[PDB]
Structure 1
Amino acid sequence: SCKLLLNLVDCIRSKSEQESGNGRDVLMRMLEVFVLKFHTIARYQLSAIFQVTDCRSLVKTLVCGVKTITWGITSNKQLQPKETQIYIKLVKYAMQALDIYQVQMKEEKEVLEHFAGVFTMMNPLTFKEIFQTTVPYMVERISKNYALQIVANSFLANPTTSALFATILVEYLLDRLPEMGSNVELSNLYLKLFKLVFGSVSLFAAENEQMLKPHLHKIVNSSMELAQTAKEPYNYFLLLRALFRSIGGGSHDLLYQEFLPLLPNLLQGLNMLQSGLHKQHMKDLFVELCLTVPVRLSSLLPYLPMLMDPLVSALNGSQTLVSQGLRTLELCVDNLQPDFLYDHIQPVRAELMQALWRTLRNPADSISHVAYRVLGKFGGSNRKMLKESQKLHYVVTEVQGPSITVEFSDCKASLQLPMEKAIETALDCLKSANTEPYYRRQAWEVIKCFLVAMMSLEDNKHALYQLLAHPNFTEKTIPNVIISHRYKAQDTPARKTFEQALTGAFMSAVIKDLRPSALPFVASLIRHYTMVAVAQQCGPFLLPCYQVGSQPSTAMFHSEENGSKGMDPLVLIDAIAICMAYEEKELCKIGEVALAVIFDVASIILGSKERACQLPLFSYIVERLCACCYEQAWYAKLGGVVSIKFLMERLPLTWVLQNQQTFLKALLFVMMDLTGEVSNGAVAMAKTTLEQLLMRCATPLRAEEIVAAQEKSFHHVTHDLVREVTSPNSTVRKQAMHSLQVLAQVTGKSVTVIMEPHKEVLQDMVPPKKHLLRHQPANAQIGLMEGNTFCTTLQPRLFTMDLNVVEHKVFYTELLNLCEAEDSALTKLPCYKSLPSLVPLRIAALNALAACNYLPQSREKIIAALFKALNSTNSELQEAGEACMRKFLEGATIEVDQIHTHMRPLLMMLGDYRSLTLNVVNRLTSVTRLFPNSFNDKFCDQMMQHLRKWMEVVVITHKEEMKICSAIINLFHLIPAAPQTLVKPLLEVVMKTERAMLIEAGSPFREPLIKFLTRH
């Protein structure tokens, strides 16, 4: 039937051109039936699932009919809005219909090509209207169906579609840009769309360069500031490279002149990211982004030294980066008058010259020859005296490492061969990327046999039973002995090697094809390590360093001059710390299992769990585990957080109270060192662990010792938590403020009662004492301002401030003298130099004005300052001014005469045409949101004339502006007591605009109107 109707359309067209009849309604009548046919075959196909061949033949036949009927109609003219709704239903139902192809190419791509070409020959005004409305549905369909990429890349064969649909696509992606980095498959698919849209602008240089010119700062900027605190920021850096290959090398004209004002803040960011120790391939990505910039040699001299550190890194092992590094260096050598180049290369001359010298030995004819040519281009700068000599290899000590006694059958002679390097080689093999499992087994055998043969084998079934059954194990009190690594002198050459063997055993126990043959072996050794440890530091058989009165001195460890009588069982904890501080997070599972095994063994052969907590070994465990949170790397800090979490949830609460201060300090340092680029989602975990620690420790209960310990820990913890109230760092300051709220929420006490005994810390800190607000950096100024705001926000007021008593006049007038200078020309100060925004600095002082409202003797100055902020030009500054106005709204009263005298200018410029801009409308709707009695019906009547003038301008200038007319109607929603007689005239002109523009699907004049309409 569709086959017959495929060729029957031309007959209708031929008969319709003979005489002027009625054929428009007939053609659209079957189209609705065809649209309904899509729904029938798409809604019931989920429950229904030859069938597949018939279904695809029906879809292909009907789609060709849809293309054919559109071909006869269009072959432009403007389309009526009613059938655009039908097309909205058509496209919505078509995506659900395109599902049979999934269960079962060449014809699949062909049929999608015909479907994608239906909208190519349609009116562009209606083309963008339908696709903008149904852009989120299409993205969601791609999230479920992966075959729409064939349709996606067919939008650029040679249509005019890509020149218009891409504008909507990029706007939708920018709206949900922060969503990237949370999920996995959603971020990758969004990145794929970014690659395809960047391919279109790169392939078609016409009418795509102008589209990319605006809203380009957000793509470059917001990607950088959102990858700092995210889980997988690897997708953000994958997006910037694609933009670089499109803004340069191809479309270049108005894009080059737009990327220039972003190089200062972008090039100085990539320099800091490449100096970290994040990962192995991540650093290679950073040096690729910093180099190969889409900027020519000009307009780069002032920023030349910032491209030298990445050049050194690119010439240090990577196959592709060395080739690119030589090309970048060769380009500079070409035309730069190398005496100028020698001046800018001096700081990194030693590193670059050594890198070039070492790149002449690799087995490659495309690198050594290029490097030799580059070196020959230098006159004599490649052999000048280096101020830093080459590093040498030296041996610190003169001792003998581990050896294996192997005897021969000749002359009765034994041989001792060292295997120090063999263990290191085995560790490298286990850490390698592409090695066969056969050599992994051999490497594991070397570690296993060396570890077994090193320890002794004695006391078979006789001495072990007597020692474990001996008395004074569950009766005698364990002496308080503290074990610390702070007294360690130097690592012996054998301790490091034995540490490496243990780490290899732990790593070999998690890799698949070796796990079942290593878990019992590793677990049994850990049990052996613990039992020999507890037999040495116990009561009845204590060593002389384990007396009641003892010292943590060097004799505790294995050293040269002061040893522990040979290989004390303390290296197991060191191996646990190293494996938990590995770049791969697959060792955390075995790390916590080993810790659980260690406690399980100790809790059995000691009688009770609380007595095992007093054993001196756990004192060294926390110090070793908390030392991993001080390294500059981020994965090491994560290992410490996991160790903190495991020891908190498992071992009982009485232990935690004693070491709560130590855990809090370790969990607090992580959020302070991580400021510029934080992590792959580590501080979020740290905040959760801190929140869990506070709820567990502050939970009310029942012996006298537990209560005394709980309040003793409470006094020590709360003292530290008031220390960062005025901290210059915002992350710790906000966490500390949130720390106090949750602490009072858990317990049955208020907030100020907690901070009663610790007032002496904050007496001379939160106010300025012996200091000024102009001699300190803005980082401390904001922290002090927020401290005063938090100090005077609770309904119980602490540190009451009154002006003319003591020192409260200098501080008060200083913050009044801050909300006057707006432009940066009048604030040319040495302290206020590196402030690109200067907006957040005024916000903290503004909140202080609204924080204090209990002093009625002086309110004219603060009221004028508050209204001055509301009358500002910036958008973010005005929004915060509204926020503090709402905060100040809870005062005594606001007189009308104050409002009339403060909004005089707004009425002065009311009677003008070039004055009702977006900023003024935002100001006008903000001031009418509160105090809902400021205008009358005459003002509403005047505004009706204004909107008529606005709507008359658009219909002329059409054949930015859409938002202002949507906002001006939205202002009528906020204002109460609007006349009832104005409803009819406003809806009449709206229809007139909707009739001239012929738009009906979700107009911007509809969403605020429907809320405006339902009042009466």
Structure 2
Amino acid sequence: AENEQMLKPHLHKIVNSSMELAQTAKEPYNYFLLLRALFRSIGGGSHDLLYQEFLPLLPNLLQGLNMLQSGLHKQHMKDLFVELCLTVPVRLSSLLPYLPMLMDPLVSALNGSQTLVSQGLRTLELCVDNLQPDFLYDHIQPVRAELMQALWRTLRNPADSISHVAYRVLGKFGGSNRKMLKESQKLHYVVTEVQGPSITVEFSDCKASLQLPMEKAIETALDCLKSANTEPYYRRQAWEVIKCFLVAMMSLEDNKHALYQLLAHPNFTEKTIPNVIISHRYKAQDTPARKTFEQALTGAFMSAVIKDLRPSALPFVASLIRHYTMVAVAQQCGPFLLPCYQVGSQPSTAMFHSEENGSKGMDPLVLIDAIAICMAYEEKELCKIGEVALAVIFDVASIILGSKERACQLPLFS
């Protein structure tokens, strides 16, 4: 009764300030928490005083929240956006001309966490109970495939109440819950026929052997190493899987004297380096082997960040980066030149491993793709290991070539 008079004059002010400042802020999280608290306070009870001043704020606020939740953001940020944009303290009577801007976040809330799917089903029941079926159907017509697919997926939710309310709203929809979906449901399919990487296993009891594919195994390892909910020993097992996959997918046919005689040649430090340009614009689609290699490499780089896995992951990662960069400089420099790196050559698919001829052996340039996808990872702590990888690459390149400025002409750096 008394405090609503001092908050009303500043409502528009704080709303607009938080909306325009979080866009160019350093940690735009506390502002959205403040907005959520303000919405909760305005919705709590029937104030009927701040409602009049909040009504003219929906035209821009709803659009901004929709643009925010539609863009790519971290999981917690997206959850906060979708939950604060759905729980607006405004009655449906006035949200009619601004209702269309609530289906895009609704379909995401239905696909979100348990709290998010519950809030989405709550809003869906609220709008289907407080509005005529015809207008609501004409309203959801633009986005019906996603909404119905999410309502059908959440029906299998372990939570009994969630599935029950989902079934209740589906029955409330009536015949519209099964209308033809022009945007037909998507289904998984394979794009290539070549087999992915596998590990050889033998059986001495029957004098035979098998091949164990490990694409989905590496995928599971990376997935459980990325998430934070996994336990430490499972992370260690996944790191072990990735390490054995990495070490099993290389030749390991190098000698000490032979390596010394190969790297100790005057041409490596005297001959001009071919200035060919590497560009993924000519690179074909990623083969199963290459994507599995990238996944294993990024999983190793992540384990190098994991605290309990760092002591054994960081040295192995450094040594593997050394191996990759050394084989690269050996195949692309020295007296032995590949038919695609000689003088006068041009960019081509021979530099990358592809389903076509491509290169003769596995492309060592995949290490750069791993560092790229790691630095572009959602978590920024991974950028440290990427910088360490680049540092060791440059250092060992200058060591093997000397005259640091000369080691930068390698197409590897391009």
Give a deviation string over 1:482-529, Cα, whole Å, max 9, x none.
Answer: 111110122111100111000011100111111112222111111111
Give the C-alpha shift of residue 274 in structure 1. Answer: 0.6
Give the C-alpha shift of residue 405 in structure 1. Answer: 1.4
Separation in 1, partners of 2:44, 2:392 = 60
User: How many pairs does the alignment contain?
Assistant: 413
2:254 counterpart (459, 475, 497): 459
Separation in 1, partners of 2:7, 2:402 = 72
Separation in 1, partners of 2:254, 2:117 = 60
1:324 correspondence with 2:119: yes
Separation in 1, partners of 2:325, 2:25 = 40
CA contact (8 A) 1:360 1:371 kept: yes
Give the C-alpha shift of residue 414 in structure 1. Answer: 0.9
CA contact (8 A) 2:154 2:162 kept: yes
CA contact (8 A) 1:271 1:310 kept: yes
2:98 counterpart (279, 303, 306): 303
Give the unaligned 5+ runs of structure 2.
Answer: none
CA contact (8 A) 1:209 1:251 kept: no
CA contact (8 A) 2:303 2:309 kept: yes
Give a deviation string over 1:759-786, Cα, whole Å, max 9, x none.
Answer: xxxxxxxxxxxxxxxxxxxxxxxxxxxx
Matches within 5 A, 1:381-420: 381-420=176-215
Shift in alpha-carbon separation, 1:216–1:540, aligned structure 2, 3 A: same
Separation in 2, partners of 1:370, 1:572 = 49
Separation in 2, partners of 1:287, 1:532 = 49
Q: 3-state DSSP class of the match of 2:144? A: helix
CA contact (8 A) 2:277 2:411 kept: yes
Separation in 1, partners of 2:73, 2:173 = 35
Separation in 2, partners of 1:373, 1:514 = 48
Matches within 5 A, 1:24-35: none
2:343 counterpart (548, 563, 568): 548
Matched with 1:566 is 361
Q: Could you tell me the TM-score, scaled by structure 2's length?
A: 0.97
Matched with 2:40 is 245
CA contact (8 A) 2:285 2:354 kept: yes
Q: 3-state DSSP class of the match of 1:297? A: coil
Give a deviation string over 1:554-593, Cα, whole Å, max 9, x none.
Answer: 1111112222102021111000001000111111111111
CA contact (8 A) 2:110 2:150 kept: yes
Shift in alpha-carbon separation, 1:525–1:380, aligned structure 2, 3 A: same
Give a deviation string over 1:841-900, Cα, whole Å, max 9, x none.
Answer: xxxxxxxxxxxxxxxxxxxxxxxxxxxxxxxxxxxxxxxxxxxxxxxxxxxxxxxxxxxx
Q: 3-state DSSP class of the match of 1:404? A: strand
Give the C-alpha shift of residue 602 in structure 1. Answer: 0.9
CA contact (8 A) 2:275 2:411 kept: yes
CA contact (8 A) 1:401 1:418 kept: yes
Give the C-alpha shift of residue 375 in structure 1. Answer: 1.0
Matched with 1:371 is 166
CA contact (8 A) 2:156 2:163 kept: yes
Larger relative contact order (CA 8 Å, sep ≥ 6): 2
Q: 3-state DSSP class of the match of 2:353? A: coil
Q: 3-state DSSP class of the match of 2:174? A: coil
Give a deviation string over 1:593-629, Cα, whole Å, max 9, x none.
Answer: 11111111111111211111112211xxxxxxxxxxx
Separation in 1, partners of 2:152, 2:402 = 66
Give the C-alpha shift of residue 251 in structure 1. Answer: 5.1
Give a deviation string over 1:103-145, Cα, whole Å, max 9, x none.
Answer: xxxxxxxxxxxxxxxxxxxxxxxxxxxxxxxxxxxxxxxxxxx
Give the C-alpha shift of residue 237 in structure 1. Answer: 0.6
CA contact (8 A) 1:423 1:497 kept: yes
Give a deviation string over 1:34-73, Cα, whole Å, max 9, x none.
Answer: xxxxxxxxxxxxxxxxxxxxxxxxxxxxxxxxxxxxxxxx
Q: Could you tell me the TM-score, scaled by structure 1's length?
A: 0.40
Q: 3-state DSSP class of the match of 1:545? A: coil
Give a deviation string over 1:252-295, Cα, whole Å, max 9, x none.
Answer: 12211111111111111111101011110111111111111111
Shift in alpha-carbon separation, 1:568–1:309, aligned structure 2, 3 A: same
Q: 3-state DSSP class of the match of 1:214? A: helix
Give the C-alpha shift of residue 249 in structure 1. Answer: 2.1
Give the C-alpha shift of residue 459 in structure 1. Answer: 2.7
Q: 3-state DSSP class of the match of 2:310? A: coil
Q: 3-state DSSP class of the match of 2:98? A: helix
Separation in 2, partners of 1:568, 1:399 = 17
CA contact (8 A) 1:359 1:371 kept: yes
Shift in alpha-carbon separation, 1:411–1:215, aligned structure 2, 3 A: closer
Matched with 1:290 is 85
Matches within 5 A, 1:807-956: none
CA contact (8 A) 1:402 1:420 kept: yes
Q: 3-state DSSP class of the match of 2:9? A: coil
Matches within 5 A, 1:465-480: 465-480=260-275
Give the unaligned 5+ runs of structure 1.
Answer: 1-205, 619-1016
Separation in 2, partners of 1:265, 1:364 = 36
Separation in 2, partners of 1:214, 1:469 = 78
Q: 3-state DSSP class of the match of 2:211? A: strand
After the TM superposition, which parts of structure 1 deviate over 6 Å for at least 4 consecutive aligned residues?
none
Q: What value does the CA root-mean-square deviation take over the aligned residues?
A: 1.2
Shift in alpha-carbon separation, 1:459–1:294, aligned structure 2, 3 A: closer
Separation in 2, partners of 1:309, 1:353 = 13
Q: 3-state DSSP class of the match of 1:472? A: helix
Give the C-alpha shift of residue 361 in structure 1. Answer: 0.5
CA contact (8 A) 1:227 1:233 kept: yes
Separation in 1, partners of 2:310, 2:14 = 46
Give the C-alpha shift of residue 390 in structure 1. Answer: 0.9
CA contact (8 A) 2:69 2:105 kept: yes
Q: 3-state DSSP class of the match of 1:379? A: helix
Q: 3-state DSSP class of the match of 1:228? A: helix
Separation in 2, partners of 1:247, 1:450 = 56
Give the C-alpha shift of residue 471 in structure 1. Answer: 2.1
Give the C-alpha shift of residue 410 in structure 1. Answer: 2.1
Q: 3-state DSSP class of the match of 2:332? A: coil
The structure number with the bigger radius of gyration is 1
CA contact (8 A) 2:145 2:185 kept: no
Q: 3-state DSSP class of the match of 2:252? A: coil
Q: 3-state DSSP class of the match of 2:195? A: coil
1:513 correspondence with 2:308: yes
Q: 3-state DSSP class of the match of 1:424? A: helix
Q: 3-state DSSP class of the match of 1:414? A: strand
Q: 3-state DSSP class of the match of 1:489? A: coil
Separation in 1, partners of 2:40, 2:266 = 77
CA contact (8 A) 2:79 2:112 kept: no
CA contact (8 A) 1:483 1:616 kept: yes
Give the C-alpha shift of residue 536 in structure 1. Answer: 0.4
Shift in alpha-carbon separation, 1:344–1:360, aligned structure 2, 3 A: same
Matched with 2:326 is 531
Q: 3-state DSSP class of the match of 1:415? A: strand
Separation in 2, partners of 1:394, 1:568 = 26
Q: 3-state DSSP class of the match of 1:417? A: strand
CA contact (8 A) 2:74 2:378 kept: yes
Give the C-alpha shift of residue 215 in structure 1. Answer: 2.2
Give the C-alpha shift of residue 353 in structure 1. Answer: 1.3
Separation in 1, partners of 2:43, 2:200 = 66
CA contact (8 A) 1:273 1:286 kept: yes
CA contact (8 A) 1:312 1:352 kept: yes
Q: 3-state DSSP class of the match of 1:282? A: helix
Give a deviation string over 1:788-822, Cα, whole Å, max 9, x none.
Answer: xxxxxxxxxxxxxxxxxxxxxxxxxxxxxxxxxxx
Give a deviation string over 1:876-934, Cα, whole Å, max 9, x none.
Answer: xxxxxxxxxxxxxxxxxxxxxxxxxxxxxxxxxxxxxxxxxxxxxxxxxxxxxxxxxxx
Matches within 5 A, 1:91-130: none
Separation in 2, partners of 1:488, 1:397 = 16
Give the C-alpha shift of residue 340 in structure 1. Answer: 1.3
CA contact (8 A) 2:294 2:370 kept: yes
Shift in alpha-carbon separation, 1:320–1:469, aligned structure 2, 3 A: same
Give a deviation string over 1:444-496, Cα, whole Å, max 9, x none.
Answer: 11111111111111132121011112222222111221111110122111100
Q: 3-state DSSP class of the match of 2:201? A: strand
Give the C-alpha shift of residue 433 in structure 1. Answer: 1.6
Give the C-alpha shift of residue 443 in structure 1. Answer: 0.8
Matched with 1:224 is 19
Separation in 1, partners of 2:6, 2:409 = 69
Give a deviation string over 1:302-325, Cα, whole Å, max 9, x none.
Answer: 111111111101000310111111
Give a deviation string over 1:414-440, Cα, whole Å, max 9, x none.
Answer: 111111111000011111222221111
Separation in 2, partners of 1:574, 1:273 = 29
